[PDB]
Amino acid sequence: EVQLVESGGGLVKAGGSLILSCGVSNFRISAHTMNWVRRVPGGGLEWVASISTSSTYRDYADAVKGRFTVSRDDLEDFVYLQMHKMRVEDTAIYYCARKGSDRLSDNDPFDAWGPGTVVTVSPASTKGPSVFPLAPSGTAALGCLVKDYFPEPVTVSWNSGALTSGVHTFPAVLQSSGLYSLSSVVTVPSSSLGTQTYICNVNHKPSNTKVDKKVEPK
Amino acid sequence: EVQLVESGGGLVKAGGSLILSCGVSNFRISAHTMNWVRRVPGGGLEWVASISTSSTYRDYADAVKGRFTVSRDDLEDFVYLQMHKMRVEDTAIYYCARKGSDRLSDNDPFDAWGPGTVVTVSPASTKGPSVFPLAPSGTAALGCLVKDYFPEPVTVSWNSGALTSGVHTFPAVLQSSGLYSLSSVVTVPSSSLGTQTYICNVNHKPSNTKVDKKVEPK
Amino acid sequence: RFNGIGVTQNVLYENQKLIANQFNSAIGKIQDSLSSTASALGKLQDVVN
Amino acid sequence: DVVMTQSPSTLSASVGDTITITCRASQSIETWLAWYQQKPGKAPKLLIYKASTLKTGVPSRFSGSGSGTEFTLTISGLQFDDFATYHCQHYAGYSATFGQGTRVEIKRTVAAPSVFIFPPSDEQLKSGTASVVCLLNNFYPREAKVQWKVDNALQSGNSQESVTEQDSKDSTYSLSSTLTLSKADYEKHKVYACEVTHQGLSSPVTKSFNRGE
Amino acid sequence: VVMTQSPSTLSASVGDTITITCRASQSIETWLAWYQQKPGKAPKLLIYKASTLKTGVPSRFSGSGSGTEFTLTISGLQFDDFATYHCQHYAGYSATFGQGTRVEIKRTVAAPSVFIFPPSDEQLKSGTASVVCLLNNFYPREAKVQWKVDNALQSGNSQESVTEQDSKDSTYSLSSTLTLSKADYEKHKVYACEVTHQGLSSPVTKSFNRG
Numbered sequence: 011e012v013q014l015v016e017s018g019g020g021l022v023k024a025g026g027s028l029i030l031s032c033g034v035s036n037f038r039i040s041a042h043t044m045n046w047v048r049r050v051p052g053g054g055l056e057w058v059a060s061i062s063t064s065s066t067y068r069d070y071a072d073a074v075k076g077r078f079t080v081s082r083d084d085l086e087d088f089v090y091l092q093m094h095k096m097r098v099e100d101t102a103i104y105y106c107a108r109k110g111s112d113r114l115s116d117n118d119p120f121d122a123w124g125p126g127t128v129v130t131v132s133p134a135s136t137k138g139p140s141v142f143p144l145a146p147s148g149t150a151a152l153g154c155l156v157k158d159y160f161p162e163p164v165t166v167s168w169n170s171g172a173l174t175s176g177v178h179t180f181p182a183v184l185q186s187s188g189l190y191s192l193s194s195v196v197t198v199p200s201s202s203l204g205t206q207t208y209i210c211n212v213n214h215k216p217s218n219t220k221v222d223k224k225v226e227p228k
Numbered sequence: 229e230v231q232l233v234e235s236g237g238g239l240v241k242a243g244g245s246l247i248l249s250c251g252v253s254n255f256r257i258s259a260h261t262m263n264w265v266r267r268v269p270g271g272g273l274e275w276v277a278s279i280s281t282s283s284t285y286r287d288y289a290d291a292v293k294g295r296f297t298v299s300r301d302d303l304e305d306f307v308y309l310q311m312h313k314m315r316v317e318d319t320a321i322y323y324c325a326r327k328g329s330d331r332l333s334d335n336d337p338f339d340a341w342g343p344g345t346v347v348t349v350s351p352a353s354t355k356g357p358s359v360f361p362l363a364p365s366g367t368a369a370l371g372c373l374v375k376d377y378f379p380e381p382v383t384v385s386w387n388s389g390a391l392t393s394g395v396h397t398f399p400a401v402l403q404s405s406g407l408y409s410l411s412s413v414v415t416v417p418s419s420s421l422g423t424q425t426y427i428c429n430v431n432h433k434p435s436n437t438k439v440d441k442k443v444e445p446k
Numbered sequence: 447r448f449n450g451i452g453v454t455q456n457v458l459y460e461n462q463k464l465i466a467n468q469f470n471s472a473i474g475k476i477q478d479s480l481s482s483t484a485s486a487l488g489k490l491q492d493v494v495n
Numbered sequence: 496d497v498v499m500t501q502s503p504s505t506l507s508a509s510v511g512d513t514i515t516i517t518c519r520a521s522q523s524i525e526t527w528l529a530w531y532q533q534k535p536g537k538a539p540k541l542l543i544y545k546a547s548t549l550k551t552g553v554p555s556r557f558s559g560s561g562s563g564t565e566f567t568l569t570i571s572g573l574q575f576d577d578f579a580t581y582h583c584q585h586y587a588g589y590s591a592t593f594g595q596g597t598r599v600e601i602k603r604t605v606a607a608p609s610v611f612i613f614p615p616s617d618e619q620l621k622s623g624t625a626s627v628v629c630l631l632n633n634f635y636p637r638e639a640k641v642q643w644k645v646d647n648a649l650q651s652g653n654s655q656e657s658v659t660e661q662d663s664k665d666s667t668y669s670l671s672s673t674l675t676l677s678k679a680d681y682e683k684h685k686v687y688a689c690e691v692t693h694q695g696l697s698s699p700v701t702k703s704f705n706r707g708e
Numbered sequence: 709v710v711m712t713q714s715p716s717t718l719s720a721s722v723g724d725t726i727t728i729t730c731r732a733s734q735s736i737e738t739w740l741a742w743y744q745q746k747p748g749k750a751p752k753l754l755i756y757k758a759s760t761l762k763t764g765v766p767s768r769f770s771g772s773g774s775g776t777e778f779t780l781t782i783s784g785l786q787f788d789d790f791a792t793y794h795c796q797h798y799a800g801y802s803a804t805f806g807q808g809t810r811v812e813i814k815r816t817v818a819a820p821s822v823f824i825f826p827p828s829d830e831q832l833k834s835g836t837a838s839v840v841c842l843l844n845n846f847y848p849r850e851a852k853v854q855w856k857v858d859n860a861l862q863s864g865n866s867q868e869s870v871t872e873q874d875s876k877d878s879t880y881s882l883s884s885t886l887t888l889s890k891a892d893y894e895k896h897k898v899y900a901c902e903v904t905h906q907g908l909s910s911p912v913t914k915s916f917n918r919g
């Protein structure tokens with residue numbers, strides 16, 4: 011028996027990027043042309059890429075040609091597949107199989123395969139923010155809490171740029187959900203809380219989302 | 229300017245695997261020793277891997293030695309870094325750095341750097357499930373419902389193996405949270421809903437989190 | 447040796463990597479032959495038989 | 496360039512049946528076909544490494560043929576082991592292409608789905624998520640369609656389906672569909688229904704419930 | 709090879725001449741370099757071969773030393789020079805770095821003004837509670853925030869973020885967010901934030917009672 015061991019596969023976002031790799035055991039890849047194959051949710055096998063012995067010639071299936079790059083390491087026995095700007099239909103199990111035979115030739119089938127690794131390309135390429143008020147309970151503090159937006163960045167202004175003094179817009183934090191969240195605050199005179207209107211202008215160019223939120227006492 | 233662009237960042241779990249890569253423009257990589265570097269939580273740098281010209285030598289810091297693997301593919305100008313068995317201290321920005329000078333020598337600093345990509349290793353190496361009853365409305369259907377676990381499997385049995393006829397446990401689904409969900413069901417005579425107490429004895433075997441739930445009419 | 451077969455010796459240097467690679471590849475086929483095909487040794491096994 | 500025209504897309508049979516399948520190349524190849532089995536979610540296994548040319552270690556029940564344009568696979572009395580997909584491949588030096596695989600399956604008469612709808616448990620709902628489940632408990636053949644309607648509004652994009660493979664005692668398929676809604680959105684509407692069509696049904700079947708009743 | 713760098717934080721005024729020292733555990737000859745790093749940016753080379761200034765690096769940066777003692781001198785700090793800095797031993801096919809030094813603008817000690825904010829009703833109705841503790845306009849940068857719920861020390865459920873030095877008053881500000889589901893937040897009443905800082909003779913606590 012001989013073995014191949016795919017790694018790196020998981021959840022992805024459309025127009026995002028991932029890299030797969032395949033290790034091996036009981037054999038050396040330095041003799042073999044190495045191939046990537048996938049099984050789509052529709053159940054059919056698609057060939058994806060190959061790279062020759064001696065790393066000479068690299069070839070691709072026409073759905074991934076130009077978008078993907080196949081790579082190899084003949085010494086530690088690893089193969090790689092960069093997947094730049096994935097499509098929703100790049101969702102598949104991705105297998106790494108060796109072109110091979112007991113005696114090798116200038117044309118053979120795939121005589122050993124690894125168990126395959128799942129890749130899912132979720133269709134949400136950009137997510138637009140939610141915006142929530144940070145309500146002011148001398149000097150008072152108020153703000154806006156931008157949340158659940160992807161990718162960066164978000165820009166925030168206050169009163170269309172007329173209110174700049176005392177404003178702090180914080181660096182975003184990356185949540186364990188894979189989505190970003192930032193807060194923008196401003197300190198102002200407590201006396202102005204009854205008359206002055208405070209509006210934070212949240213712009214998210216990647217989703218083409220604009221939100222104007224008025225922040226007022228509860 | 230010299231152009232470098234990393235790809236393949238984002239979230240990972242302790243004990244998990246990832247692959248980084250970097251591609252370049254305005255130079256060919258083949259004349260350069262190439263490196264990976266990271267910025268650990270104290271704002272300090274660490275060097276992570278270096279691969280020489282023609283892939284002759286590969287050296288690593290002791291923290292990542294034997295866990296990681298660098299590779300390069302000069303004919304398309306790409307560099308790769310596999311990260312098997314990631315651990316929480318690998319949480320950092322990562323960068324692809326060129327060893328170089330205005331005039332290259334046998335030993336040089338790192339001259340051109342890509343903008344970097346973030347990698348986060350979350351400590352959720354075995355996230356235990358949430359387990360919930362599916363309550364019976366001549367034949368009745370009941371069940372149990374598993375949400376929010378990683379990795380697979382979550383395993384289920386009915387009354388510690390006393391019930392097996394009409395039992396089904398469904399294939400897991402990968403949620404947009406990046407965590408698994410499934411359900412287990414059984415069909416039984418409606419007359420038995422009053423006398424027989426159905427229970428599901430479960431385990432998330434990776435975390436060895438053993439759970440039970442009685443299923444009875446609401 | 448290329449001058450010995452009457453081939454002008456620059457035909458080696460202008461092709462030296464191609465010739466080195468064809469020698470190395472042809473030595474590779476010897477292992478595939480001798481590993482796979484026990485009947486290649488037929489004369490020596492005939493003498494021993 | 497070659498495309499493979501494999502036929503049928505699904506073959507129905509049973510234990511001990513001799514079965515034949517056929518791959519037809521859209522333009523001629525020099526007998527460069529091979530054939531694979533694939534069990535659900537597994538790696539394929541190579542059976543026949545050139546047309547009519549069985550791989551060593553493969554069970555002797557397998558066979559096939561090739562004519563440069565038309566080709567076959569044949570199995571000499573199916574085992575319970577054989578009820579998997581089968582794929583033809585045309586393999587060239589640095590590329591390949593495959594047939595849309597012939598799914599081999601255990602035959603029976605047509606059977607319509609028993610449909611059941613489940614509301615979210617109160618215990619799920621208090622956490623803020625509502626998962627509404629529709630169960631097509633047993634039917635044959637595999638192909639069925641389920642649509643969700645909320646307040647008679649056809650839903651789109653908020654459900655996930657999975658099918659269990661053939662049951663060990665009756666060989667029926669079964670489907671469940673999960674409609675996912677936050678607690679907020681779920682309490683916005685009353686009726687939650689699923690509508691089913693299938694080979695055995697003369698009209699669509701709808702199961703519904705009213706939230707809170 | 710191992711290296712040490714001192715001081716870990718250097719506070720100075722604009723125009724000052726400052727020195728940052730690197731010490732190697734064993735002789736490294738003149739095989740050492742220096743790097744400037746801004747927040748959120750990859751490091752930029754300043755000096756190599758101990759003293760060799762990189763082409764285009766301003767003349768105010770200089771380096772000296774050999775064997776085990778090395779110094780980076782900035783002669784006349786400009787506002788651009790207030791950054792992270794790192795000594796770096798380099799060898800034919802490898803390197804190593806010291807711990808770094810952070811250079812900041814010096815000002816008097818200023819204690820944080822502390823504020824705690826409970827979760828908004830809107831967010832709370834969605835099922836998540838994010839309290840936010842704010843430490844406003846403090847100096848120096850080191851501050852510690854501990855969250856306590858019903859006098860219970862929290863751990864692993866908060867994240868922090870800190871601003872860069874304010875351009876007008878040279879202070880820092882810090883926000884800490886403790887995140888809890890609605891299911892976990894309603895379990896406990898009081899939510900406190902215990903702050904320690906060089907400007908506080910004893911820790912300061914701001915709290916609220918749920919509801």
Ligand SMILES: *[C@@H]1O[C@H](CO)[C@@H](O[C@@H]2O[C@H](CO)[C@@H](O[C@@H]3O[C@H](CO[C@H]4O[C@H](CO[C@H]5O[C@H](CO)[C@@H](O)[C@H](O)[C@@H]5O[C@H]5O[C@H](CO)[C@@H](O)[C@H](O)[C@@H]5O)[C@@H](O)[C@H](O[C@@H]5O[C@H](CO)[C@@H](O)[C@H](O)[C@@H]5O)[C@@H]4O)[C@@H](O)[C@H](O[C@@H]4O[C@H](CO)[C@@H](O)[C@H](O)[C@@H]4O)[C@@H]3O)[C@H](O)[C@H]2NC(C)=O)[C@H](O)[C@H]1NC(C)=O
Binds near residue numbers: 067111114117
């Ligand atoms: C004078 O004559 C000589 C020959 O006598 C000429 O030299 C030859 O020139 C050809 C044309 O330029 C080159 O052909 C091209 O090569 C590339 C790459 O080929 C790689 O694979 C070769 C085969 O290796 C296989 O097969 C053998 C058995 O035959 C096995 O032992 C081996 O292990 C390996 O097996 C694996 O791969 C198979 C598929 O390849 C699988 O079926 C197996 O199961 C297994 O996985 C190999 O020998 C080559 O060796 C290298 O060659 C490099 C130079 O090309 C050289 O740099 C290096 O050092 C090695 O020596 C390669 O590794 C193919 O991809 C080309 O395919 C065509 O591409 C076209 C598009 O570009 C396309 O339209 C067309 O359809 C084809 O797909 C093509 O075959 C030869 O490689 C080259 N040979 C040598 C020894 O140099 C010379 O050029 C000529 N000069 C003049 C002026 O006339």
